[PDB]
Amino acid sequence: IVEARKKRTAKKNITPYQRGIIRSLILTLDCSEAMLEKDLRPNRHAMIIQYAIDFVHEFFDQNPISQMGIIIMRNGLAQLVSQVSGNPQDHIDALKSIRKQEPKGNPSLQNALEMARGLLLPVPAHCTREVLIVFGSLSTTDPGDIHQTIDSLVSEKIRVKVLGLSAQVAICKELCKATNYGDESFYKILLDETHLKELFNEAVTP
Amino acid sequence: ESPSLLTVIIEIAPKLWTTFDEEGNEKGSIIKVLEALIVFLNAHLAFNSANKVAVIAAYSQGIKYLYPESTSALKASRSDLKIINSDMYRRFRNVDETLVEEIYKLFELEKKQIEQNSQRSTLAGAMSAGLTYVNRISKESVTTSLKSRLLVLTCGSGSSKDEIFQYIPIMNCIFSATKMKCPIDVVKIGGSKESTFLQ
Amino acid sequence: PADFVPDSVSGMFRSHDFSYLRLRPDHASRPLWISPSDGRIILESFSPLAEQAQDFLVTIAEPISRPSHIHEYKITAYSLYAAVSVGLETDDIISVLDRLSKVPVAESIINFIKGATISYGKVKLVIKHNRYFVETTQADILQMLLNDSVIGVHSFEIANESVEVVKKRCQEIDYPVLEEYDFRNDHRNPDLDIDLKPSTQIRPYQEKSLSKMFGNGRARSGIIVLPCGAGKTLVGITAACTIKKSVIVLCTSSVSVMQWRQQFLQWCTLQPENCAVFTSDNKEMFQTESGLVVSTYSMVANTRNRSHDSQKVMDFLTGREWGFIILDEVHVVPAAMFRRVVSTIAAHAKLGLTATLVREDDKIGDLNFLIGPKLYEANWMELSQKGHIANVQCAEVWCPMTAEFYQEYLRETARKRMLLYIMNPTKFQACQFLIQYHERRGDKIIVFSDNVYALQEYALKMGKPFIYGSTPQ
Amino acid sequence: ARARKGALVQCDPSIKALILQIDAKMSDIVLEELDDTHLLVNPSKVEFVKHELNRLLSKNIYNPM
Amino acid sequence: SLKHSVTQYLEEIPQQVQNRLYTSPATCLAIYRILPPLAKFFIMAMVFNENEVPLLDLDKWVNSNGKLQFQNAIKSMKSLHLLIPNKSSGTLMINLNPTFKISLRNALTGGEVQNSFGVVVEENVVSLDLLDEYSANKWETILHFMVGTPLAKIPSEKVLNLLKHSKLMEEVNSTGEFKITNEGFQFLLQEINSQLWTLLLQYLKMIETSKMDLVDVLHFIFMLGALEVGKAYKIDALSETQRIMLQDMRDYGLVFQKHSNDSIFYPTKLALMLTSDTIPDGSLIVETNFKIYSYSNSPLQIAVLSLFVHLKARFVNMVLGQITRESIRRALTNGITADQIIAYLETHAHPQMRRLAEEKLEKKLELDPNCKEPLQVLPPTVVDQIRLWQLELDRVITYEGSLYSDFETSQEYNLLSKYAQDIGVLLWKDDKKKKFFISKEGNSQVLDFAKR
Amino acid sequence: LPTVCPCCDLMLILSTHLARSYHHLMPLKTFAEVPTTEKFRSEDCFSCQSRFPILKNHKNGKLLTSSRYRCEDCKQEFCVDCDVFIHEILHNCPGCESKPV
Ligand SMILES: [Zn+2]
Ligand SMILES: [Zn+2]
């Protein structure tokens, strides 16, 4: 019960903070060679797809008005697998289709960020622009300067939250800090299986 | 096949039922709805051997669990009043006697606290309490696969209009019941044909 | 018993109802069940604190069986002898067994522990200048032996051929003989600079077996059994490198002698000038003060009129006090004069390496008298699940005998019946189908048959090569 | 179109070959042979045949002590 | 299983006896609890309105996804004679049984129930200390008698005749011992509620004498299901037939009595378990060396395991045993099939064996996902060995009958063989050998065919 | 639903779709652990009337770390099951609605 009280103490920070209800979430899922690592049962890529399916279900259960698109990073390219729409069934079918294919390649954060920037451009001003990047690898290869992309995302009020799989990547931390107005808490790294479940369940809140 | 839990949220208010008695030709409709509820609970307990019954009353000054009794009250008790005949089935008899005893106690409390008129209906809080009890019976999991069902016996009687403060708690109860797959049946006794929130 | 009321369901138990042992309140953590009838120990592997008891049982007990869930061990005298030798005192074993068992340790089991553990290390066999001396630290133990008196601080010389009789007689008495070689403190025998090459890695089960052999810092004569291909030869090399004395190795075949010489010159830093082979072609011995000699059981134990060179080499082997003997395939040691190779060679430490420690006669139980106690059992499922040995799918194909073949099977003598049940055509069809199926899978297949005529007939019918005794080399 | 008192038995050719030696040993075991799988055992000894069959096949079964 | 057996027994009850059975409200309530949920829903919606309800209206209740189940419910109400059909105005009108409806309404609302639920005498004892112990004592006594273990106390001759005249538990007087049948080991398999039900329906099958009335037995069984444990009830409401069969279950263990022919009787836990239900003891570990480590301390599980396991040692927790060839031969000589033994070993399997089988199947699916395999909780080697011992028991099967041969014409042989095939008694025929064989029961038919 | 209208580019939502996100706008304050020495209002729970147990963690624990969770407005007592159920599935305190405001 002392550990339970420490758990209860962390819940004492209750504030009626204003949150963006209407959201336009872009889920970026890694599909690289590092997705073939078997530290996560049974492989990394299948678990991320299944938990993304569960995340889509929970997000559309709790945020119905919010729209969502799915982008993967594969072979150095950003592949948009489901357009930004309010129907969760299309995203579920897209994730089920991606589950069959084998991940490969060296991921490109800049290509995914540019594709999401193109996707979030017709989003209205009242609808918040958020990107969720499930980054599995530790290094990324970009065709250009990623700092210009970060500055453009900051100028377009797009907030990026990155869940990393292996370690704390500096460019992801810098991107989260720049997009979240200096908040370094939006870069999250798991510890075990249930921590990944908790981190996926944390992102459904606005 | 699978036993279920019937949680009854009855809205007994002395102001609400008096308006229904004045509008109707008959008087004392509380007794009629109570005995109909008692026969319905005996019917539900006859459906399966392992089903359970919860009854919660929402009165003017708050809510109170009619059945089962409070564990402090159960430990304190037992004056077997003769409201219900003792020759019936004991499983029905215990539930009926407990229910009518708690009706007696709650109406004595209402008679004692009749001087204060409350403008805050407690039906939504009673539904929330019933949902907590339903989760407890599911969470407790003493019995495999208990299912569940809320039944709200409310009365409008053409006096209580639509209550805008109830909107968010009723919606939250809807989402909670959808999460736990608990159907909510509603019986409304009164002249108001349309009740938008309960519909 | 403990005044336990007998239930009607205990009728068919032949005094094996152990319900009088009161169950402990904290039993669920304890993974053992001690049977007072025979000292048999029942271990649950799936519980916590199982391996911390499994090492204790494999040090103090002999495993009867090791299935997946429930393991069955035997508390025996020889296991307790190795238990006390590696430094486990008597009270520690009783305290740990009391702490790690659900049922209480019965007084019969405790008395067995005291009886087998005490009176150990009293009588010792030592070798001084190629002469066997039995030695005891207490005086009256010499005077209580008046039956098997083979006499020829407190010690008397026994004959070299009579050492086995002394070991049997002292095992019958409550004073078992201690056979340990203190090679660290032994200076009469000249040392060897033999040591393992740094590039050679040793697997953990081999390390565990050698820790059973060299637990107390003194080499203990005994038997090690490992699966074929698990590296028993490397265990022999490492034991020779640990003792660092003159080594004699006995094998069953000349090709085994060649393989042992190759393994010695490969895994350890032994020069070929320190290695000698006693075979028919090669009879030159090493000229140094210490070294390795490898030979066969048959030539060493040859009672026939051997050649002059072989007689000179045998005189060299007998007149030299050896510090270590490695008996490969020790299951053939209990034979008639393969038994005598421990008598004709004065060796301080005797390690018997085998894979098949069974014989159809009871003389396989004589190796504790010949070599020493069974030091280590390899768990073949534990090695198979770690990839050290193959995961074999053992099977037994039932081939029905045909009508005309089975009629002749019953009207015949057993010697002809043996030939007749081999050559049933359904076995031909089954063998042909299995050969075809496993050849399509791309498998190297060996078909074993002890009958030479059946081997030739199957090979001629199926168009495959056959190898038997009369085939040229 | 005549009637006898016998019992028809189903067996594999191995057991068929086994019970003919029972006929060669004891006369009143089988009356006549029908097929390679159907035999006609006298019903007064069938259980006795059973009582020897497991005894006859006991030599093919290894029983640990 | 359980509901099907009592449903089929109530089908065999005649309609007038069935309507006479609906007098007591407790019987009607206990019968109503057996019905399917759609049938129970239709009955409960149909009791409180006195007017008859059309069948087409009941058809509109059910959605298209459960319509077939609706028919099944109707079939149950077409089997138990609760719904009376009527042909009126071109419609198949449905009316409720009046006695059943009145008794169910009296059970629900309360009123005239003619003491069908008994009267509480307010004097009581501890259920777990005495009532659970007495019922378990009698049940363990009869079960230890029927499994064949020696007992210092044997049950009375009322249940010995019950076991003798039943299909299970055959008895022989030439030796002096009792032989368990296949149905006996079947009875040891399922849970105790349907065991009690099978026993009670067999007792109902035996009762034909004028000493005992069938409707009173059914009423008493259903009110015993209605009675609650921990409170005694008075004997005065029962008849003398009900009194002697109350003494019969006092011997059997469904009811407790302080003394013989007492004024009160105590219901047991088996009375409430008669209606519906609600590592463990007897959990076992099977290894490749046929060693059984059965975590059992109750003598019942040890006794039923001794039927096919050569027991070696007994601890407080398990019984160290081994599945030997001789023990399985003992089990098969009692008619206990190998499938029953394998099912028993599956149902009592340890959770650790289940975890190992789950891990093996998880390694299998990630290796060969093209095919799916059943969860073999116990090793397949011992299953194959059990089935092999079953096969070596039945290497020969002996059919006794008559063989007809010595036909001078093939047409007569063909006519007799096709007649024997038409009457379904032929087992083998051959025109080349001119022989055809018939069974023992089919001899006389061919005899009167040939003689006439 | 909820989707944009394909014929006039208008959002089409229900009342429940707006209702699903109200609980973020007025989240409940977390319930406070009751003191051990403080006199408890009810021996059982309020939301589900579960009896709070003897709660003797050790031999002389008495009612230490009592499972009642006092609300900040209605001061009602909730067990740990009710506390985690309101933190996960419900989003409204029954005691705050039973109060006759
Ligand atoms: Zn609660
Ligand atoms: Zn509150």
Swiss-Prot record, chain A:
Name of the protein described by the UniProt record: General transcription and DNA repair factor IIH subunit SSL1
Lineage per the UniProt record: Eukaryota, Fungi, Dikarya, Ascomycota, Saccharomycotina
Organism: Saccharomyces cerevisiae (strain ATCC 204508 / S288c)
Miscellaneous: Present with 2340 molecules/cell in log phase SD medium.
Whole-protein coverage range: 102 to 307 of 461
Domain VWFA residue range list: 24-203
Function: Component of the general transcription and DNA repair factor IIH (TFIIH) core complex, which is involved in general and transcription-coupled nucleotide excision repair (NER) of damaged DNA and, when complexed to TFIIK, in RNA transcription by RNA polymerase II. In NER, TFIIH acts by opening DNA around the lesion to allow the excision of the damaged oligonucleotide and its replacement by a new DNA fragment. In transcription, TFIIH has an essential role in transcription initiation.
Subunit structure: Component of the 7-subunit TFIIH core complex composed of XPB/SSL2, XPD/RAD3, SSL1, TFB1, TFB2, TFB4 and TFB5, which is active in NER. The core complex associates with the 3-subunit CTD-kinase module TFIIK composed of CCL1, KIN28 and TFB3 to form the 10-subunit holoenzyme (holo-TFIIH) active in transcription. An additionnal subunit, TFB6, plays a role in the dissociation of the SSL2 helicase from TFIIH after transcription initiation.
Location of the protein in the cell: Nucleus
Gene: SSL1
Family, per entry: Belongs to the GTF2H2 family.
Domain of life: Eukaryota
Swiss-Prot record, chain C:
GO CC annotation: cytosol; nucleotide-excision repair factor 3 complex; nucleus; transcription factor TFIIH core complex; transcription factor TFIIH holo complex; transcription preinitiation complex
Catalytic activity line of the entry: Couples ATP hydrolysis with the unwinding of duplex DNA by translocating in the 3'-5' direction; ATP + H2O = ADP + phosphate + H(+)
Necessary cofactors: Mg(2+)
Domain of life (superkingdom): Eukaryota
Top-level class of the enzyme under EC nomenclature: isomerase
Function as written in the Swiss-Prot or TrEMBL entry: ATP-dependent DNA translocase. Component of the general transcription and DNA repair factor IIH (TFIIH) core complex. When complexed to CDK-activating kinase (CAK), involved in RNA transcription by RNA polymerase II. May have 3'-5' helicase activity alone, the TFIIH core however has no 3'-5' helicase activity. Also involved in transcription-coupled nucleotide excision repair (NER) of damaged DNA. In NER, TFIIH acts by opening DNA around the lesion to allow the excision of the damaged oligonucleotide and its replacement by a new DNA fragment.
Record's protein name: General transcription and DNA repair factor IIH helicase/translocase subunit XPB/SSL2
Source organism (scientific name): Saccharomyces cerevisiae (strain ATCC 204508 / S288c)
Whole-protein coverage range: 101 to 633 of 843
UniProtKB/Swiss-Prot annotation, chain D:
Location of this chain's protein in the cell: Nucleus
Pfam families, per the entry: Tfb5 (PF06331)
Matches recorded under SMART domains: Tbf5 (SM01395)
Spans through the membrane: none
GO biological process: nucleotide-excision repair; nucleotide-excision repair, preincision complex assembly; transcription by RNA polymerase II; transcription initiation at RNA polymerase II promoter
Keyword terms of this UniProt record: DNA damage, DNA repair, Nucleus, Transcription, Transcription regulation
Stored InterPro entries: TFB5-like_sf, TFIIH_TTDA/Tfb5
GO annotation, cellular component aspect: cytosol; nucleus; transcription factor TFIIH core complex; transcription factor TFIIH holo complex
Keyword DNA repair among record annotations: yes
Superkingdom, natural source: Eukaryota
Main location group: nucleus
Complex formation: Component of the 7-subunit TFIIH core complex composed of XPB/SSL2, XPD/RAD3, SSL1, TFB1, TFB2, TFB4 and TFB5, which is active in NER. The core complex associates with the 3-subunit CTD-kinase module TFIIK composed of CCL1, KIN28 and TFB3 to form the 10-subunit holoenzyme (holo-TFIIH) active in transcription. An additionnal subunit, TFB6, plays a role in the dissociation of the SSL2 helicase from TFIIH after transcription initiation. Interacts with TFB2.
Family according to the record: Belongs to the TFB5 family.
Protein name: General transcription and DNA repair factor IIH subunit TFB5
Recorded name of the encoding gene: TFB5
Curated annotation (Swiss-Prot), chain E:
Transcription regulation found in the keyword field: yes
Subcellular localization: Nucleus
Gene Ontology molecular functions: ATPase activator activity; double-stranded DNA binding
Pfam families with a match to the protein in the record: Tfb2 (PF03849), Tfb2_C (PF18307)
One GO CC term, this protein: transcription factor TFIIH core complex
Keyword flag Repeat: no
Disulfide bonds: none
Keywords for this protein: DNA damage, DNA excision, DNA repair, Nucleus, Transcription, Transcription regulation
Gene Ontology terms: biological process: nucleotide-excision repair; transcription by RNA polymerase II; transcription initiation at RNA polymerase II promoter
InterPro entries registered for this protein in UniProt: Tfb2_C, TFIIH_p52/Tfb2
Coarse class of the protein's main subcellular location: nucleus
Top-level taxon of the source organism: Eukaryota
Coiled coil spans: none
Misc: Present with 8900 molecules/cell in log phase SD medium.
Role, per record: Component of the general transcription and DNA repair factor IIH (TFIIH) core complex, which is involved in general and transcription-coupled nucleotide excision repair (NER) of damaged DNA and, when complexed to TFIIK, in RNA transcription by RNA polymerase II. In NER, TFIIH acts by opening DNA around the lesion to allow the excision of the damaged oligonucleotide and its replacement by a new DNA fragment. In transcription, TFIIH has an essential role in transcription initiation.
UniProt family annotation: Belongs to the TFB2 family.
NCBIfam families xrefs: tfb2
Protein name in UniProt: General transcription and DNA repair factor IIH subunit TFB2
Naturally occurring in which organism (per UniProt): Saccharomyces cerevisiae (strain ATCC 204508 / S288c) (Baker's yeast)
